[PDB]
Amino acid sequence: QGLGIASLVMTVPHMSPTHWRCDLALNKPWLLNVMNNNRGAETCLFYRSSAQFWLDEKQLVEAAGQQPECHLPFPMHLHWRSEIFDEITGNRLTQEQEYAHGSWDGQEREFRGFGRLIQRDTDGFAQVDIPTHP
């Protein structure tokens, strides 16, 4: 599923159909995920497979009919987005981290970064006329 750790898999070569998965978990573990201050802060840490990102960049540029070749072949799971909240008003804000041209060292085996980054956000409100503009 792009979990960043192995989901369970099998075949029973007895009947004509044979394959199963087993379910496991929805996240790669031990990532900080959230922090707080007792003044009432939070961090809604959101985090996504860079390899999923690659399949997405691939899929969308093939929907653009382009030849895809991400110079990053190499898997890791990376932070992706977060929410923050107004502890008293219940307003909030979204922040998003996005990226393209994954790269890797074809000689030293090293993460060569992303050629392009894309960065996005919105505040949001309980409202009453004001439109947010990402």
Partner 1 sequence: QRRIKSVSVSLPMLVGPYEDVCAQLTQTSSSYST
17 binds partner 1 (CB under 8 A): yes
How near is the Cβ of 11 to partner 1 at its closest, in Å?
9
Give the DSSP H/E element, type plus range, for residue 20. Answer: strand 19-22
- Of 96, 113, 95, the residue nearest 104 (C-alpha): 113
Q: Which residues pair with 85 in a beta bridge?
A: 92
How near is the Cβ of 19 to partner 1 at its closest, in Å?
11
- Of 116, 16, 17, the residue nearest 72 (C-alpha): 116
- Which residue is it, tokens 């000689």? 107
Binding track, positions 81-120, relative to partner 1; x by CB under 8 A: ----------------------------------------
Give the binding range for partner 1 (CB under 8 A) out of 9-17, 38-46, 80-88, 89-97.
Answer: 9-17
In this structure, how many other beta carbons lie within 10 angstroms of the beta carbon of residue 91? Answer: 14
Measured CA distances, 65 to 8, 94, 99, 101 (Å) = 34, 31, 20, 16
Within 65-84, which residues bind partner 1 (CB under 8 A)?
A: none
Which lies closer to partner 1 via its Cβ, residue 19 or residue 109? 19
13 binds partner 1 (CB under 8 A): yes
Which lies closer to partner 1 via its Cβ, residue 13 or residue 131? 13
